[PDB]
UniProtKB/Swiss-Prot annotation, chains A, B:
Forms an icosahedral capsid with a T=4 symmetry composed of 240 copies of the capsid protein surrounded by a lipid membrane through which penetrate 80 spikes composed of trimers of E1-E2 heterodimers. The capsid protein binds to the viral RNA genome at a site adjacent to a ribosome binding site for viral genome translation following genome release. Possesses a protease activity that results in its autocatalytic cleavage from the nascent structural protein. It comes from the Viruses. Homodimer. Homomultimer. Interacts with host karyopherin KPNA4; this interaction allows the nuclear import of the viral capsid protein. Interacts with spike glycoprotein E2. Interacts with host IRAK1; the interaction leads to inhibition of IRAK1-dependent signaling. Residues 45-50 are annotated as: Interaction with spike glycoprotein E2. This is Capsid protein. It comes from Chikungunya virus (strain 37997). The record marks Y77, N110 as: Involved in dimerization of the capsid protein. Disulfide bonds join C3-C18. Residues 73-83, 109-113 are annotated as: Dimerization of the capsid protein. The active site is at H29, D51, S103. A motif (Nuclear export signal) lies at residues 34-44. Residues 3-151 form the Peptidase S3 domain. The chain holds residues 111 to 261 of 1248 of the full protein.
Length: 151, 151
């Protein structure tokens, strides 16, 4: 709720940035700048291999960072627009939820820990398969289902 | 309660020394002499890499030694000036607690065992992070966050 910041361009909202651990993450394909006067001055590194950019959080903001884990048991998870179902190694969301411009939203576990960042999604009749970026011990990985499109 | 001795310099209180296990421990950066007449006569060894000084406990005072362990599960702990929380590999306390000259205080477990000596910390708005000297199997180790300052 407090860890989400908006990225704007010419008055419109393009997407969100999130503070996790000690790093700031922003999707690579999203245009614009960060509204916060202090975060806007950070230098970023880019990698097109995962569509990620990251930077180091300044000291005085560390108390506002969210917690994270890597464990992914089967069950139900929550996010800004409702619940998301995890089964079979894939995230699914009821059709109609989510629109372009809402990329960068976290997915939370029951205790509020971050498990994934949503970057678009695929088209299917009754249920939507999501395209996500997740992590593991000392690695990151990009998981993209067939037919995924950018949001 | 009984294991803490006061170190003074020219009438002013500089810090505390702890009697733990079979050793007397004092932070290296604190000046002054030990109030106890017997302890002031001991020979000391120094290591500037860990900011520690220690000496062997004399025979007739050993009955005052506290117990200790090395296990550090996540949870809550207590100290002289309030509560301390341990999570994420760091010890943190609410902002405003702690003042210069209080260095050398123990952190206690639920059963009264010593787990750490506190030597300063880093300060931000809502919370502070402590700089601590801790130990592990057959070694000692020093953990210091970015921006820490001495107390």
């Amino acid at each position: 709720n407090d860890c989400i910041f908006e990225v704007k361009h010419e008055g419109k909202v393009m997407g969100y940035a999130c503070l996790v651990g000690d790093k700031v993450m922003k999707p690579a394909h999203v245009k614009g700048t960060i509204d916060n006067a202090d975060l806007a001055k950070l230098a970023f590194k880019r990698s097109s291999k995962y569509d990620l950019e990251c930077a180091q959080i300044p000291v005085h903001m560390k108390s506002d960072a969210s917690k994270f884990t890597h464990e992914k048991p089967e069950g139900y998870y929550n996010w800004h627009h409702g619940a998301v179902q995890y089964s079979g190694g894939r995230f699914t969301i009821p059709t109609g939820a989510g629109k372009p411009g809402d990329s960068g939203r976290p997915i939370f576990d029951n205790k509020g820990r971050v498990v994934a960042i949503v970057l678009g999604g695929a088209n299917e009749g009754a249920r939507t398969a999501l395209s996500v970026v997740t992590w593991n011990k000392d690695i990151v990985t990009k998981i993209t289902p067939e037919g995924a499109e950018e949001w």
